[PDB]
Symmetry: D2
Subunit: 367 residues, 4 copies
Amino acid sequence: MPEAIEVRKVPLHSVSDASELAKLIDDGVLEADRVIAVIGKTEGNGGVNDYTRIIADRAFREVLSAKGNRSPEEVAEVPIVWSGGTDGVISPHATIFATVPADKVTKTDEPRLTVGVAMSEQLLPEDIGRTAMITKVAAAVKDAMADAGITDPADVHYVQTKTPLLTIHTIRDAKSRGKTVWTEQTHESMDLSNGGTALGIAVALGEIDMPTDEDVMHSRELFSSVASCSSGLDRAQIVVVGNARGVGGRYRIGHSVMKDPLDQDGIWAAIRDAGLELPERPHSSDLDGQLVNVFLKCEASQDGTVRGRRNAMLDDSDVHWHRQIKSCVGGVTAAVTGDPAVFVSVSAAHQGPEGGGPVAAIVDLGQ
Amino acid sequence: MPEAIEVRKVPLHSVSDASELAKLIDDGVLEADRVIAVIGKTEGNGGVNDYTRIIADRAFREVLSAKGNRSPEEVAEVPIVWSGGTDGVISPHATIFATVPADKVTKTDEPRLTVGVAMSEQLLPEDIGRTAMITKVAAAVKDAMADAGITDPADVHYVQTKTPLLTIHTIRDAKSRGKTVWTEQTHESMDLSNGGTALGIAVALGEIDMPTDEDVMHSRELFSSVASCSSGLDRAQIVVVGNARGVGGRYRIGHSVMKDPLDQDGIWAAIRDAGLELPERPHSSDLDGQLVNVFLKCEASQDGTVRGRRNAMLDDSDVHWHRQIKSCVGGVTAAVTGDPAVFVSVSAAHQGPEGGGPVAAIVDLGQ
Amino acid sequence: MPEAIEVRKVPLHSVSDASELAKLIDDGVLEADRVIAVIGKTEGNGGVNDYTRIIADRAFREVLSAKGNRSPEEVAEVPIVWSGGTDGVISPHATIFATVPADKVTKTDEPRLTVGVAMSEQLLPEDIGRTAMITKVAAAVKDAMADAGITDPADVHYVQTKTPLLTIHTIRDAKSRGKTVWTEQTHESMDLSNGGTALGIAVALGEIDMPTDEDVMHSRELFSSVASCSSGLDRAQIVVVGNARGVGGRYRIGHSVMKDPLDQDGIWAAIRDAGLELPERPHSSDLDGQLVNVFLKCEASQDGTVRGRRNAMLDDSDVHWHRQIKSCVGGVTAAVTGDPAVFVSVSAAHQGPEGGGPVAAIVDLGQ
Amino acid sequence: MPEAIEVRKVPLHSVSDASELAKLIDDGVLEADRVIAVIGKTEGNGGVNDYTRIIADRAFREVLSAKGNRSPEEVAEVPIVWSGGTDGVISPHATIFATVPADKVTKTDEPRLTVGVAMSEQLLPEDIGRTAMITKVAAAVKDAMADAGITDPADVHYVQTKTPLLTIHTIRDAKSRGKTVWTEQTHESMDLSNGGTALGIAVALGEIDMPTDEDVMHSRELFSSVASCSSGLDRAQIVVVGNARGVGGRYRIGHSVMKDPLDQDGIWAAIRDAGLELPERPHSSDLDGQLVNVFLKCEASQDGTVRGRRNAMLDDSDVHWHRQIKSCVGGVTAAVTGDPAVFVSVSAAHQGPEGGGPVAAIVDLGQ
Ligand SMILES: Oc1nc(O)nc(O)n1
Ligand SMILES: Oc1nc(O)nc(O)n1
Ligand SMILES: Oc1nc(O)nc(O)n1
Ligand SMILES: Oc1nc(O)nc(O)n1
Ligand SMILES: [Cl-]
Ligand SMILES: [Cl-]
Ligand SMILES: [Cl-]
Ligand SMILES: [Cl-]
Ligand SMILES: [Cl-]
Ligand SMILES: [Cl-]
Ligand SMILES: [Cl-]
Ligand SMILES: [Cl-]
Ligand SMILES: [Cl-]
Ligand SMILES: [Cl-]
Ligand SMILES: [Cl-]
Ligand SMILES: [Cl-]
Ligand code: NA
Ligand code: NA
Ligand code: NA
Ligand code: NA
């Protein structure tokens, strides 16, 4: 059964800092054993050789193990997703999701935040980017969606995932058994792994019909409107975030789409959808501390243009467009929220329309 | 005497493309010999080894020479400033400034756009970053300010400059005569050259008292509110842009300040100051094609924070913060204008407050 | 008929410098109209957005047009290959190949340098990286090989090429006609274009049997021992360099293979093969100004190891391994020649064994 | 009293791998509590935001604490220097230094390896790069030199150090007390901290007279021939490595200088100086497993040339010359040793002549 959720966004003061999580536990805001998911941004390069993700992961799991009754083995099964790369003003942070004990919940028929978690069946190197990944992910998303107590896909607003990369060893693992892989460049496998996962989410939620192998990274009109996929277990980790009626709690999630890197109105639409009443032309000062965080994807479009204007992102061998567009949308987004602590993630194949991406917002509607 | 000004922003379709300038001349929008200044963004890395600036410079001067009566020598004296680096959505473009023949001008008492140009006395390597650069720049700014027909410094809204770097040869040139230089790193000399130039502008316009050598790059509370300095002649090139009454024309300039990288309200204040009436909470769709361009500076603050949130820009050895903050503010700015063709420049020592910078806007008020 | 060849390596003093070529012509070392090929290194980033290649190309073709009777159209057909990226000590330079007038040649039965040039049939975006590119290249290599007066493939020591990339427009050009492309990442298309071209050279010279599409970038045991391919016309440009008996001249070419990035003995083997007698353990001081240049390829092996030791090149999202291994092998090679002006090129799929590449040497055997 | 030393170079299989150290302890090669120093290369970017250094540091200290009787506090005082950045073929590794118990030592009058350690007095931000750092370092080097049982500075072959950087907090710490700092760019403070430390070593060992503040980073003819300084405690950590007679052991150290990035003969001179007899023109195959490691510094010269040839390292805003020259000299060095596991460090102000650096070699002379 779905439980009421407490959500807290905390800053990371350094690469290995989990002190703010420790403080939340100490002050009784949440119990260590009730942390069911963490979604954060780390200050690494955001690519393959980003070791800030494991540094934060160790620091956070050490807190959870030290202050709870869970074993390191049980703590190790908590989904924690670290999206590296905080280019520009983006501030390293972690959004903590925890269940609320029944004696602190006020049950209500209003839609309130609920979280579902699942793990897919083993992802083979040869599956990555193909229909095998799509079917296995789609099944796991259906699992997590049911685990959240959500029956209507329209009540799912945000599916944050984690999927593996193709490495030198897994690439051999395929060739040992005879098989081919989609790509042998590990950096490109990042975009591929997120894309194939996104297609699985879109299928599970009924946003698209089952695609074919030749659609992956090619048919960019096929996408999920709630998928936020990251890489890079030998299995897709799934975190479904939506709303359920009759659970209680003070937070609510909504979403929309950023049609391109400058679509601030899409971000405001997400915040409105989450339940915050805002003016017709809102401004960051209207939020009054009620926006916990936003979670969105961005990408450089394959046509090399934004609103009719050419940019040179796709030809830049000096600074990969991953970093360029992340910094850009980081500013666009933080300008809306007024808080540089925003979850902005790059590599958005099949996640929102080309050149854009989904955007979810969590707001505090409680007293 | 100040003349009425025609202003046109055109895209660059490639690194060597000046076809849009050629088209403006062919269609009679402006005469080649009346082009007095060009200010543009090029798609290079924006650092020391950025050769897109010279490629655009050659392409543009070839057009001016081919379609005018001016010799290549006279064309060579036209101030053309190319700010490299178009990280993110920023679109390569050039803003062309031209005088209008008297038989096409409607004289008016309303403030309208006027441009003044000057060259300072020779800048010695040992001057760069010291009071020598400040005094020589301040004198040239007073020259250009008078050349624009501007007597009140409050009527100066935008001073775009070009100053040299410290190179292996000029560094010897100093040591040959005995002298020391401020830095021997050419990449750092970029920030220094712009900073010392900015202090000169601030002195000339009476924004600050004459500083000392130890203030340069250190006393960041001393700044000009209209300086936009770029590098990197052995002389400061100065382009003063302001308004004059009784000249006529259809364009007007205004300015404000971006207090930090997310200060969109500062950009809107510049547009309002330029003469466009806008709603209380404006949006890009209110502009109705009346905003020609904005010109602004950005920088990562030395305290490493934006609105109380830590970022890791100053410690990033992978992608210099020059590129990170440029992409970020590029998005913030283009979100306001709705046009990725924006003049966003990085390296803003003594140009606006720390972590921010000046922002000027040119609007079309004509029929 | 093959003509005797004069070969001169000159430095570039700046990005746009062709003064050393101009000096060679002025001093009567060579005639402008007799320049048949130029192969050089430019100081750009060596990737997609490297504009130092076109800057050098324009500067060099302007010299050839200005000092010869050839029209700009005829000069435009001279194969000039600029390999960008001079990471580390590699010094920007150009190797100039020119025919010698008959009244300056001493015919000899000794093997002496000869150059052959050809152009393949149009390369379609959909051909790139597939058997279509391989067959079209193989035919052009047979053309250039015959144009050099070479009948035995063992007399071909160095085939320098130029092939196009997959761009946003050509990718559409395929999809407009229905077709698929190998990759849509332009940076990766560099490695693909060179690889498919290398396979064509290997087929033409009988080094391999005709491969299949699934071999390209995958069967790295299939390679040419003389191919040096660069990108990125809509056609493979081919420059075959070998030896012919009975032509005369003072230069001779030889080659071997660099088995890995540290294989200096492979470079020395190339110099020995070119005709220079050297000690058993040679050193750079044994060359006595008789080595004109070396031309070689390098790459990071897919197994991520060099001589049993792991390196992290393939996982580095900060500095692409293209640049890392180029700088590394630049030092290894310049340590052998004693001259930082070495032609070191990266991206070596099907060019020498995995982790290595071919290496050719041109020596001056004349009085 | 100096003790006999056991030296072992082990690879790192991953960023957090200390298994090879654990194996050495388990097999009885060395005792955990007798490890007195570790000097290693890690696969990070080698700049300010390199977190592979702390990852390796934690992994290695955890082994030392787990397998010894030393407390984490005592283990924390063991000097461990991690030089990040393994550009090109350089393989991540750690050289472990341990004392040998008396019942395993064969005392000999031959010069054999000895290690001395010291800590300087507190380094103030305002000291960095000035005569204060030089005097405090010089005193600590004299301490470590005596701790190694070395009386003649000619018997010191290698002084590996660790010194702090200037950070946002320490820079305030100076300005709070009134003081100025040398630079406010943290990336540049790396080169400064190593330079000032190198001058201290040179003074202590009598290689130079006491310099002045204006010499630091400027008088590059003043240098130590054994200093290898890294950054970045609030104190200079010192590791002196030399030879002593009458101690016993099987290893010996020697050194020379690399006059420029291609000076392989300098590396061979170091190996010869260490006691290995080699041919006149040695080759890597002559080493027969007797070379434990080499330790050297490299840098791009301020004149921008190597052996009369221009390179573009100092103007490269895309890939800092730190990374370019490190990869280059990594290849040059590994070509000599035949082992990519080489200690190659960049940033060499006052460490060997300009454009070069010291090079030390440790060889195994035992049965
Ligand atoms: O670590 C990471 N960061 C981002 O922004 N995207 C991915 O796929 N991974
Ligand atoms: O070329 C250039 N671009 C920018 O943004 N800033 C400077 O100083 N130069
Ligand atoms: O321009 C260029 N340089 C190199 O080294 N390799 C390729 O394919 N292109
Ligand atoms: O971490 C590090 N690596 C190197 O090569 N040089 C310094 O100063 N620090
Ligand atoms: Cl409960
Ligand atoms: Cl509702
Ligand atoms: Cl309203
Ligand atoms: Cl007139
Ligand atoms: Cl008014
Ligand atoms: Cl209103
Ligand atoms: Cl003839
Ligand atoms: Cl022969
Ligand atoms: Cl011999
Ligand atoms: Cl003992
Ligand atoms: Cl001896
Ligand atoms: Cl011998
Ligand atoms: Na998308
Ligand atoms: Na500023
Ligand atoms: Na190869
Ligand atoms: Na040095």
